[PDB]
Amino acid sequence: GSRKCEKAGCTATCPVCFASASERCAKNGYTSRWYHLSCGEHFCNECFDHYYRSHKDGYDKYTTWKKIWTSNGKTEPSPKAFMADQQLPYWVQCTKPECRKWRQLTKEIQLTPQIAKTYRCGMKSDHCSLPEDLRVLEVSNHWWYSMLILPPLLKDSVAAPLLSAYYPDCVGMSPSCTGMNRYFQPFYQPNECGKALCVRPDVMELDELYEFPEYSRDPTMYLALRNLILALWYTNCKEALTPQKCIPHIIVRGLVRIRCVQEVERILYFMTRKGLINTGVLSVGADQYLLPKDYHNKSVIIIGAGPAGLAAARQLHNFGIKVTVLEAKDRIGGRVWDDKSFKGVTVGRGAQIVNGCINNPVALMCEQLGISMHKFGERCDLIQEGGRITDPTIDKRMDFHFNALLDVVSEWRKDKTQLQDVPLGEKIEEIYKAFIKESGIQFSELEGQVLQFHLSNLEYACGSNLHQVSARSWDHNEFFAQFAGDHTLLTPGYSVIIEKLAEGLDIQLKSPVQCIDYSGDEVQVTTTDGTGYSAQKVLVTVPLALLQKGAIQFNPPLSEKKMKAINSLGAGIIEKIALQFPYRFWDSKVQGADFFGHVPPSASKRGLFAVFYDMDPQKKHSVLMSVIAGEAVASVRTLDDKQVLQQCMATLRELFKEQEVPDPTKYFVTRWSTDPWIQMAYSFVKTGGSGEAYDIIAEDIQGTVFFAGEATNRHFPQTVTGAYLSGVREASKIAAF
């Protein structure tokens, strides 16, 4: 026999058998062949044969395992795999602060999270004083992993139950193993259509390969640790996820467990910086910062305290980075602004709906806050002035035609460039006329009016009359995976999330920024009253309209490229009206539906209260909300609030013609259009424009000036979610520096 190892380049000058399974085990002596698992782990040819040979006592145990490993995995069941999976002793790190030595557990002991959580040397003299096995240090040599035969496979991963559709060994888990918020679906399932904020359990994302190139050859270990980390975060999103919390949940045999534990911290911090975990409204204070002291030296001025500014500020603050927020208005929130004065209900003057809760940051934050959302039902009757609910067949007939018009638009645009763009509204019109011409079919006036409702609904979505919006690019964002699942009413209002994000941050109100100078060593920021601020980096999150107006003086000036992109998007607008009543007059006719539609008498009036929203899902209080979109936004600019209220009440008395309607006892009418520091509702792509505009606006300048806000998120434009995510995005970029 020999004392040398098979593996070329192995530094084991004295192989010893860890298995001792054969009554003939060679121990530290001679054997025909030493089989290598790592630089510190070998088993002799006798113990090899003990399992591998049919006439040996350990053959049963190896064939049974070989069967489970077949009905469960995609990797070949080799004896070395069996060894690493079944016989290799566990290692656990002493938890005594001043020791922290790694210890080998005896071969019969099965390591559990509870054992790892509290382990100290000797747990069955000063056991902590016994020297650490010399093999432990070796593990932190980069070549150590390179001479590992097989990649680690985790046991009982917290991620396991979420991945039952994959081969465990394809996602870093062991084939021989084995009440979450329904909105948490972090992992793509096999054969799934795209959905927002999902990762593949079996493939590294582009940014991941960028940060951890050493895993491009074999991503097994990374995926297992990343998947575990996400599972743990979503299992409990109310606490910071730390390495200490993860380590006990890393269960794998062998010295490799030490390498896994050493990697988890790197991956944790990357996940945190990028905003995948330890995020949302989670708050962390002095001596709880989520990123190492290495990121802390730096400073930032954030301009704007809406969802985007507050997202970035929350992230950076939690990171340990010095942040100051400058807000123009006497309040935070921006286009989030809730009226809490209504009886028993919260009514948003701005945003209040969550579009697609699955994996939505907003859904996460509701979880963290213990907030419940109301899922909208599907029903939305199209009610005519005055009284008549639209015939179901007429309804279906015109829905079909409306969407058929969209199909042909999407067909027309395929070969058109930005230089040939035409307005969506004009395109739809032409296609419609040319269809009635082609086919002698003729629609009634009502059928035409129902079509107008649908058109109005497009205008609400874009915040613009359709003759302004791009036929080519109106729905550009759907090129990317969107947020799936329920649309909900955020009944408590977005303001609760806003408050929570801002709590304890350094925020200066009534401080409108007028000048940003990034020509010197650090950014000089000056307010409209001449007050000076300075920091290493600046993030601007002001609304698109304000960038278009040029209310902030940039030195040096924004690029011509940026200006073209800024002007190629539209500062979309809608206004809201809310009305309180003495009683729920609509219950008889509406029958519990979350909303009801209003068939337009004419094309010109189509955006005047097209949809009415019942603002109490408990059906107890009497508040209606409606919207003003498209052409009707203009028609209302010279009308005072009372006049708008009069037209809304006139509309309601028409919609409910065959009954009486009580007078409203309290109401508001929004004027976002003329709020000086906002001047809009949400962005859209103007004719001639491209989705790429969102990317161009998003582009930092010289890693010194950064941009966020709903109009900088190409994937998720318009929304609080999108604005929030753009802030997380920029916080990651800024923290990397």
Partner: peptide, 12 residues
Amino acid sequence: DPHFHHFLLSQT
């Protein structure tokens, strides 16, 4: 396939 990528992990 750009469609599916995680938004926060494709910022290159």
